[PDB]
Design a protein around this ligand. Structure first.
Ligand SMILES: Cc1cc2nc3c(=O)[nH]c(=O)nc-3n(C[C@H](O)[C@H](O)[C@H](O)COP(=O)(O)OP(=O)(O)OC[C@H]3O[C@@H](n4cnc5c(N)ncnc54)[C@H](O)[C@@H]3O)c2cc1C
Ligand SMILES: Cc1cc2nc3c(=O)[nH]c(=O)nc-3n(C[C@H](O)[C@H](O)[C@H](O)COP(=O)(O)OP(=O)(O)OC[C@H]3O[C@@H](n4cnc5c(N)ncnc54)[C@H](O)[C@@H]3O)c2cc1C
Ligand SMILES: Cc1cc2nc3c(=O)[nH]c(=O)nc-3n(C[C@H](O)[C@H](O)[C@H](O)COP(=O)(O)OP(=O)(O)OC[C@H]3O[C@@H](n4cnc5c(N)ncnc54)[C@H](O)[C@@H]3O)c2cc1C
Ligand SMILES: Cc1ncc(C[n+]2csc(CCOP(=O)(O)OP(=O)(O)O)c2C)c(N)n1
Ligand SMILES: Cc1ncc(C[n+]2csc(CCOP(=O)(O)OP(=O)(O)O)c2C)c(N)n1
Ligand SMILES: Cc1ncc(C[n+]2csc(CCOP(=O)(O)OP(=O)(O)O)c2C)c(N)n1
Ligand SMILES: [Mg+2]
Ligand SMILES: [Mg+2]
Ligand SMILES: [Mg+2]
Lengths: 585, 585, 585
């Protein structure tokens, strides 16, 4: 007969399979809290200590699962605290629903306490942004918000006046269209564009396949096409893991969160196959300036020819198109280009290994990640924060397709380590989860280590304490005339922080302390969360984008200093291998 | 001859007397950081651990001093982290300048890393919101932003492309108009409106003067007019302290962060003089429904007759107008209304005193604030956060006009305790500063306890740990049908948090522990910061807005339960004193 | 007991003294139309043919009277049509209330016909911008909107769901605050600052007083200061008429809608008193590059030191401050500067008169304005459109303090001639009202010549038909390398247009036709609107900003071609006069 509007709303969420949602209560959202209380056995409300962690975790839910992430905040400061999480979702194009509290209709526009016109606040970030003004339509307005967030892969925001969820509406007049939701059966790629793309890729002397997360399902195809046609493989930083890191022709990513082989190969390549990629640096770094042919495959029309003058752009699904190229090619024998790149990758990985393998004295980030690699399970998930850890994790973590790693890819908000590991462990309680965060990123959301304790989420948290905003110090070293300002700061002892939130923790600062501490952490994380605070040296990581190793481009003074500073004595430039296999530079 | 644009900009700030500014560096704001580095002996850059603390502290600067507060943030997530601080400034109408980083002009609109159209993000909160596109005009654009923030008492936002501060501009072509800034000499209030207002106030049988922070300078006038004409005085919560708290006819504030005498008197009053007030609850609580005449004095035309049908509204300065009323009145002898209200205030203060004066057993918020009162210096400044502490601080802190207390008055963002005490101690290094925060408000900005350590700011931090969002639990108790959800949580041991940031701290939970701990804290705070974590009981404070003490309005069962729960056995309703002095109710 | 919400909203408008309002009905604003129908005897609705005319007339009301202009539009297209009128009110800082229709609250957010979230559309232009969601607070929201538009001198926009005006609210609950209304306080001048300003003014060798419409109430003091101290006067184009144009030492306005004496003088001046002026061209034309001392007087702090570094700034009412200067000074004797300037003004006026007094020939703009002046009454109001007509009206109309002229001063929207004239005849039916419009400007709002017929508003409409966008053509001549484009077009016979809307009209093209035609127009306009379509030549008005006259700065060939083109054979540069009185240039 009747039903309360707020109860109907929680049922629309239950209909769309929403398992858990995050927020902090307040008077302006208490009628929705009331509805959640009755249904607490069907949808799990996770109370966070700061709302941006709720919004960031909701984004990570959708990143990991493909399902809509949900968070809420009370009127005014509850809702504006969501901003860094909602912009992350807009930028990383994943579906998120945010509910914002608002004063009742009876007191709106009266200029009463913590009441304002909230609709202008969400206009930029949200794809759908509405203030609900009627309780009977409120279930449809919520269903509308979810349909559009999914369809448009973005943020949908509904500001709800607190009095409407307590109203009665006729129980038969609302529905959730979850039952109509579906995946498209897309057409097969047109055979002539596939053939045209293949010929051009076969005649290339120095070819590359450069893929992004759009090729997430084409792991097998990419790797087989690589070794069948003798084409090196390189990706964007987030596409790391689609092809296993130990694959001998994986060059890594290009630019600063990058690897030496990827950068050098890109400047020599004559034909690039750009697949499901939208690398933001293409134009500003003139990455493709020496490319002769540029071939592209993307599912989205707005991307076609965006990053460079494209010769052939196929609008199609990456995996289908790669499987169709694969189906018309045969083995090619090892070329000079294949051989030179393989030798270069071996030289690089030996460098990274000698850093990782030091066994005594002062702790550096490199060995902390070798110890992370030692205790990692083959399907672990990593929530990585933003800073030097994106660079070091991309070089040292040895991922396979069973792993997941997430960060704030484009907006790049700091603080994402902790919320992402909370979302990961809620979705996958049986998978090992790691949170790799630098000290500045981890202090921005440190209060939510208590949420991991409260909901008993066994996360392995590793904080890299350098008493610096390392990523920025290095930039200041490169651009600034006057001394470093704002990048070195006071120590925070995160094992005391973790103890305050009643979580087990260790602090280490010598390489030799690592093995024991990490074995204890692997065992504690079978049941409880644990934190390791690695006090590391402030060494600058080798800048892949400022290599000074070639005698024809850098003077011997520069090369000696570069080799010295970066312990890069045994690194050879690509040109050494090119000359060796009979190629020029 | 030439000067670099970023150097000229730091000089425009120095010209407007900007002593310190807050932020966190990033690549998109490094050319401004470079300029700050050279001038580090003239403007003090304070690096915070989270940008909302920088924006909130900048707002508190202007709250305390009347001078423009300045903060900055890098592009994307640096700038959106400022939101809770900037909305606080818009709402509390104080001048703040925020500088937002942005990618260089050369890469803007190229869709490159952490680059977006940032101008839509600041459109709602800012009075002035511009992206600077030329380096020669950039000193004028900054000067423009400060002039308007001051003139309009609001937020001015400038998004600066990083490449323009490193450009050369002719040194003679820029200036800062600080030299033209001035206070208006306002006209004296028109003598006939003052006389009309006075007659109506003199004929009132049950009068009240209800003032707000607009009467900040009329402390003497308010108090003398009170005792010369026998008129009780009541204020808004932030106007507490303008007249000393021990003044026998100060009734307190009305509504929930309120006091019993203020609430009861307002329903009996026949003539209200509303002075420099903009109480947000006037309409939604029907506060003035029984008022017969409503007289108002405000400096701002948009306020005149806003909160109620006003009989006489004088547009003038509060202090000038009160001094002019005072100049034409003589002593009146004690009326029944004066006498009844005085007796009622005595009854109330005895209640608050018996709570404060318990000497053993389980710690409650009441005694923690009696201990705060004991060590307080006559001119201490209090940064108060948002939650039950606004209610308890308004009842127990004994302020005088030499004190300052600040919070987020209208927007009411949690987290303001720590940034406000940082701003207070930077401006006034010789004054004792307190930060009174509840546990949920203090965990939102807990990482910046490290900033107090790093810049050596001796703040006394007192955290009230109830393992609850107390203010919200009580609301749920009043409105919600189903059980409490989201308002009780895990303990955080803030003396371990404080130890992690290398600050001295104590944790107490028995009334008898207070005196020693507070004496030690008063002495440590002579040189270092200190934190006390008071573990308190979850007792609900007496709800002044839900009194059940009058036998003619509430049944005896209700009154017994009310008296029992709130240890309010000896509280009498106002009607007892009205009947006693020959007045009806 | 109850009243309808729509009736109370109209009662609030009546209370604030609103006599007339403009708009076009629609389903979404039909409950407001219903209310208006009931009140047709007390408040008068003016139906326009296009909604921007309604917004432009609403703006013109406030410009002419100082009282708030009121306009409305229906949902979607009705409201977006108001845009040019509303930004004109924002830019020329005048109070306007715009009511926007919206679908009822039940249909909102259901994506039904002509229903969209309308609140983001108005966020940039409106000082106050809200959607009403409740019928009982709707009178307060309308009252709030008028208070803020007056106080803030900007636009207030309220979007109203059609159902709410048809609900019954209690009659007892609403009120309008119109009775408490006051204008802002005028600050008083500090005598010490005034003495300093006066000393600097008297020590000047070549002084100028440059005033804007902030000196509206000080024409007497301005002219008196000029005659007593022997200092010439110049104004912004909108300030023309504050001092009578026939005054011998009134130099005119600077830059392009300028008069040659003002431009020449400004370059020689050593001290400028800048009074209630916000000239937008200061910095970009480097106007004050030679001014040794700049003195400013303004009521607004955001303007002090804004346009140039100010040596003495006074924050006070212009009239009060000018009265103070005048009381400290005595008669001075004629200087060379005074005499040089008067001689230059006689030369310039003699030149404009020669263009005006041609008796036979092809018609030019200059003789048509002479014809307007001969039939103009001493207190006529001029609604002027935008284009060359501002340049020509500024040079040829002889205005006194009894006249009024309005245009779109800073937004500068074409189209305003017809709406400004409608509003002026509504407000001042006893005054002669002119509409002086170029053909491009008149074409954009031509349909509302019918509003003048329908409402019997006797306006004299004068269209200047040059078959060009003359103002742009002359800009293309100055900047464009390739041929003229989009500035010359087909003729529209406006007498046939007027005939179509059933108005009396005439078409002229030879100078000798003018006298009889304007005589007849002057007679018809006592009862009916009349239009004259003056077909004029394509002659460029003398560019007062590009004077090729002085032999020592321009070649004899440039000078002769200039004099030939502009019929300026008898003009002398100010240097001739400066030299005659022993001065240098
Ligand atoms: C601190 C920091 C610095 C960074 N530095 C770097 C760096 O130096 N180097 C670097 O590489 N990255 C870096 N990144 C990440 C970077 O900002 C970009 O987000 C990233 O390069 C984008 O990768 P993408 O192209 O794989 O994914 P996206 O930008 O998400 O784009 C995916 C693309 O795939 C297409 N697509 C989707 N599905 C399919 C399908 N099924 N078939 C076909 N096409 C499809 C999409 O349409 C889109 O074009 C950094 C991140 C951080 C946090
Ligand atoms: C958790 C929380 C709850 C709250 N609960 C309450 C509560 O229950 N009770 C309560 O009272 N408050 C409460 N507040 C504060 C409340 O939200 C309002 O901000 C407060 O009531 C406004 O006080 P005000 O009128 O003094 O100041 P403002 O809102 O700042 O307004 C000042 C007024 O003075 C006028 N003015 C300025 N200068 C002059 C002058 N020189 N001469 C004349 N007029 C002048 C201004 O124009 C304006 O009208 C709460 C705050 C928090 C954080
Ligand atoms: C096609 C076109 C071209 C134009 N070309 C020119 C041109 O070449 N030259 C030109 O002059 N104009 C020109 N204008 C007008 C120009 O755009 C500006 O609108 C104008 O210069 C502003 O003049 P103002 O200073 O009088 O008015 P406003 O900009 O309105 O400024 C008024 C000032 O007076 C102050 N004030 C208000 N009241 C008082 C008081 N009581 N006491 C003291 N201070 C007070 C105000 O705060 C403000 O500072 C043109 C307009 C158009 C449509
Ligand atoms: C909220 C936010 N503020 C500022 C930045 C700019 N930023 C990018 S990396 C970085 C420093 C990262 O420092 P930390 O986490 O300590 O790690 P490190 O690089 O030292 O290992 C900063 C400040 C950001 N992206 N997000
Ligand atoms: C950032 C933010 N989120 C949510 C709120 C809503 N809110 C208002 S008071 C309150 C609880 C305060 O709790 P706490 O600080 O623990 O103090 P207590 O009341 O328990 O003493 C909350 C969540 C707010 N105003 N600001
Ligand atoms: C609505 C609008 N569109 C375009 C312009 C640009 N503009 C300014 S003056 C002008 C030409 C004026 O034409 P017209 O009204 O015929 O006058 P003329 O110069 O020919 O006398 C134009 C197009 C404007 N200010 N407003
Ligand atoms: Mg770091
Ligand atoms: Mg609490
Ligand atoms: Mg024209």
């Amino acid at each position: 007969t009747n039903i309360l509007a707020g109860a109907a709303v929680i049922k629309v969420l239950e209909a769309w399979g929403v398992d858990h949602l995050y927020g902090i209560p307040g008077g302006s959202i208490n009628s929705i809290m009331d509805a959640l209380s009755a249904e607490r056995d069907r949808i799990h409300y996770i109370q966070v200590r700061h709302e941006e962690v709720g919004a960031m975790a909701a984004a990570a839910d959708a990143k990991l699962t493909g399902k809509i992430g949900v968070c809420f905040g009370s009127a005014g400061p509850g809702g504006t605290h969501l901003m860094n999480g909602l912009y992350d979702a807009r930028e990383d194009h994943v579906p998120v629903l945010a509910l914002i509290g608002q004063f009742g209709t009876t007191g709106m526009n009266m200029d009463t306490f913590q009441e304002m016109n909230e609709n202008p606040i969400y206009a930029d970030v949200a794809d759908y942004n509405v203030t609900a003004v009627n309780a009977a339509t409120l279930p449809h307005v919520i269903d509308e918000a979810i349909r559009r967030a999914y369809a448009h892969q973005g943020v949908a925001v509904v500001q709800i006046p607190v009095d409407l969820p307590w109203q009665q509406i006729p129980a038969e007049d609302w529905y959730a269209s979850a039952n109509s939701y579906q995946t498209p059966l897309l057409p097969e790629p047109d055979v002539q564009a596939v053939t045209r793309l293949t010929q051009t890729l076969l005649a290339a002397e120095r070819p590359l396949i450069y893929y992004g997360i759009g090729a997430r399902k084409a792991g097998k195809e990419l790797e087989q096409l690589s070794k069948t046609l003798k084409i090196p493989l390189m990706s964007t930083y987030p596409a790391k893991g689609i092809v296993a890191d130990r694959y001998p022709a994986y060059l890594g990513s290009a630019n600063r969160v990058a690897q030496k082989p990827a950068n050098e190969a890109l400047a020599q390549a004559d034909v690039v196959l750009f697949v499901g990629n939208n690398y933001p640096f293409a134009e500003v770094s003139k990455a493709f300036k020496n490319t002769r042919y540029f071939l592209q495959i993307d599912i989205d029309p707005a991307k076609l020819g965006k990053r460079h003058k494209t010769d052939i752009a196929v609008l199609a699904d990456a995996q289908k198109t790669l499987a169709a190229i694969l189906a018309q090619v045969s083995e090619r024998e090892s070329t000079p280009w294949w051989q030179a790149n393989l030798a270069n990758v071996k030289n690089w990985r030996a460098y990274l290994a000698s850093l990782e393998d030091k066994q005594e004295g002062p702790l550096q980030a490199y060995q902390v990640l070798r110890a992370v690699n030692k205790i990692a399970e083959p399907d672990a998930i990593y929530s990585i924060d933003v800073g030097d850890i994106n660079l070091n994790a991309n070089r040292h973590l040895k991922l396979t397709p069973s792993n997941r790693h997430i960060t704030s890819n484009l907006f790049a908000t700091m603080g994402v380590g902790i919320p992402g590991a909370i979302a990961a462990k809620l979705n996958y309680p049986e998978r090992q989860v790691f949170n790799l965060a630098g000290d500045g990123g981890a202090s921005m959301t440190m209060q939510d280590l208590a949420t991991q304790v409260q909901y008993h989420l066994p996360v392995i948290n590793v904080v890299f304490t350098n008493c610096q905003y390392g990523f920025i110090k290095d930039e200041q070293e490169d651009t600034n005339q006057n001394d470093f300002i704002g990048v070195e700061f006071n120590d925070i002892d995160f094992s005391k922080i973790a103890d305050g939130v009643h979580m087990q923790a260790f602090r280490v600062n010598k390489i030799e302390q690592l093995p024991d501490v990490f074995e204890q952490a692997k065992a504690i994380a079978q049941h409880e969360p644990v934190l390791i605070d690695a006090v590391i040296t402030g060494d600058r990581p080798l800048p892949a984008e400022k290599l000074r190793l070639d005698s024809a481009m850098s003077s011997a003074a520069d090369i000696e200093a570069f080799k010295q500073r970066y312990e890069a004595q045994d690194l050879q430039p690509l040109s050494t291998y090119l000359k060796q296999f009979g190629l020029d530079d």
